[PDB]
Structure 1
Amino acid sequence: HDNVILELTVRNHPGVMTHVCGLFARRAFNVEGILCLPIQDSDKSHIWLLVNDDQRLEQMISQIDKLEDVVKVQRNQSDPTMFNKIAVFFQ
């Protein structure tokens, strides 16, 4: 499984997830898993995307950070099996 996990720190405002996924949509780029949780006592959230490793990711990652509501992006700084662990309880 050549997947990578992008962990985004975003503003918790309407529209943010549509802007982020929209960038994958415009590249015909499937997102495999998503988690989004608010960060307590803040106006921000984390979004985790699970996507396949692709030669276009580095430029897409740069495009994600340029979004006004994305304050930060990390790649493969999350538990690599988090979606396998979550799935076990919720399927």
Structure 2
Amino acid sequence: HDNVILELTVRNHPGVMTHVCGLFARRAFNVEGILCLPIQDSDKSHIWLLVNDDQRLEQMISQIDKLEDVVKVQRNQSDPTMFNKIAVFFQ
């Protein structure tokens, strides 16, 4: 469909979410949904980003990958409707 889920594994450090989102912001690229959770007994966190499927997305995944504190960035290996399901409980 229209959107894509990007799943990031990042270091749970101050400022990594600003850097990740700044890459999108610097291009006026909107982010539709965000879920961020720490990983249990770990120094990392998971970031799920709901974004529109885009030609520019492949280049931006590359920028995200080179970021500081980002260890892995995945496209479309998560739950495609995960934000619809969360939305049933939070509005």
TM-score between the two structures when normalised by the length of structure 1: 0.98
Q: Is the 8 A contact 2:10 2:72 kept in 1?
A: yes
Match of 2:64 in 1: 64
- Deviations along 1:9-58, one digit per CA (max 9) or x if unpaired, are 00001000000000000011000000000000100000000000111000
Q: In angstroms, what is the RMSD of aligned CA positions?
A: 0.6
Q: Unpaired runs of 5+ in structure 2?
A: none
2:73 and 2:79 mapped to 1: Cα distance? Answer: 15
Q: Is the 8 A contact 2:16 2:68 kept in 1?
A: no
1:59 and 1:40 mapped to 2: Cα distance? Answer: 31
Match of 2:6 in 1: 6
Q: How does 1:2-41 map to 2 (within 5 A)?
A: 2-41=2-41
2:65 and 2:20 mapped to 1: Cα distance? Answer: 10
Q: Unpaired runs of 5+ in structure 1?
A: none
Question: Secondary structure in 2 aligned to 1:29?
Answer: coil
Q: Which has the higher helix share?
A: 1
- Deviations along 1:38-88, one digit per CA (max 9) or x if unpaired, are 000100000000000111000000000000211001100011000000011
Percent identity reads 100
TM-score between the two structures when normalised by the length of structure 2: 0.98
